[PDB]
Design a protein around this ligand. Structure first.
Ligand SMILES: O=C(O)c1ccccc1-n1cccc1
Ligand SMILES: [Fe+3]
Ligand SMILES: [Fe+3]
Length: 301
């Protein structure tokens, strides 16, 4: 409950609504009187929740024409096979690499595995479309997405968190759908938690490019809701600072003979509580481990 953070389902702006759970939300954009779009692909088990929320705003689901995806992680595309059947006119917009992940049986295997762990006991999933059969359209870095007469979003490559990650910038509204590129926003402390799970140099380089965007009014990550005011304006820069802060912290620990597992457990214990309801505890601890391993390699003797 903060002035600068909208974290409740429902309407966020004149054109924007939050569907489903705030920790893994799906955002709804009204492009016109009979045209809508979705942003972020959530987790599979939320199919019926998101669908329920959606139908309360969209009388005719055939008016959903676009579904924008930031990256291939299980918590950002798990809904696609299960709701695309119910969205006959939708077109999934994703980066080339993100599309490649859906044509890989091994990559799909991991996405499905992690999502099934989040299923409640006796919970059944709808009739699902084949991952390789999704109505996808690959988008490239810098491409402009003419979604509607008042919605023009630019695709900006933002690798680092993952090797396929992109973000979507609505310059008209100074609004950035940044996915996980800035990390995980700490709701209790008001700072960003870095999520460097692929490449640190690219991670920092992406934040440098995003800092050069015109001053943001709304910052919408993959988890936690909508950020505004100074949080949006300073977002990219603050996320950059917090990443370096974690690096220096890592170097300090290692220089004291500490093993990566020592700080991993500490990060997991201090940060794993926010994502417990949609992220298996072993995945978070392992993710923290993978991150520190990345930072150690790209900053060590
Ligand atoms: O990206 C995240 O949302 C995330 C955050 C914390 C730990 C693991 C994560 N993860 C890694 C791969 C898919 C989820
Ligand atoms: Fe992610
Ligand atoms: Fe994520």
């Amino acid at each position: 409950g903060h002035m600068l953070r909208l974290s409740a389902p429902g309407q966020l702006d004149d054109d924007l609504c939050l569907l489903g759970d705030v920790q893994v939300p799906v955002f709804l954009l009204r492009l016109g009187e009979a045209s809508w779009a979705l942003v972020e692909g959530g987790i599979s088990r939320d199919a019926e929740l998101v669908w329920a929320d959606l139908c309360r705003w969209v009388a005719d689901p055939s008016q959903v024409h676009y579904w924008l995806i930031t990256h291939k992680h299980y918590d950002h595309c798990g809904l696609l096979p299960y709701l695309c059947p119910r969205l006959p006119n939708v077109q999934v917009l994703a980066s080339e690499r993100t599309c490649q992940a859906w044509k890989s049986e091994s990559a799909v295997r991991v996405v499905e595995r992690l999502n099934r762990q989040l299923l409640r006991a006796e919970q059944r999933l709808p009739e699902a479309c084949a991952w390789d059969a999704l109505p996808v359209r690959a988008v490239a870095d810098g491409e402009w997405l003419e979604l509607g007469p008042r919605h023009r979003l630019q695709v900006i490559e933002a690798h680092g968190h993952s090797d396929d990650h992109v973000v979507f910038y609505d310059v008209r509204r100074r609004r950035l759908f940044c996915g996980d590129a800035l990390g995980e926003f700490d709701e209790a402390e008001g700072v960003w938690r870095p999520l460097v799970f692929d490449d640190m140099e690219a991670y920092l380089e992406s934040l440098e490019r995003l800092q050069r965007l015109p001053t943001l009014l709304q910052l919408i990550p993959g988890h936690g809701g909508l950020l505004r005011g100074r949080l949006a304006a300073d977002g990219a820069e603050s996320a950059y600072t917090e990443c370096l802060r974690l690096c220096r912290r890592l170097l300090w620990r290692q220089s004291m003979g500490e093993s990566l597992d020592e700080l991993s457990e500490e990060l997991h214990r201090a940060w794993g509580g926010q994502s417990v309801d949609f992220l298996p505890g072993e995945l978070h601890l392992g993710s923290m481990r993978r991150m520190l391993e990345i930072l150690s390699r790209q900053a060590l003797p």
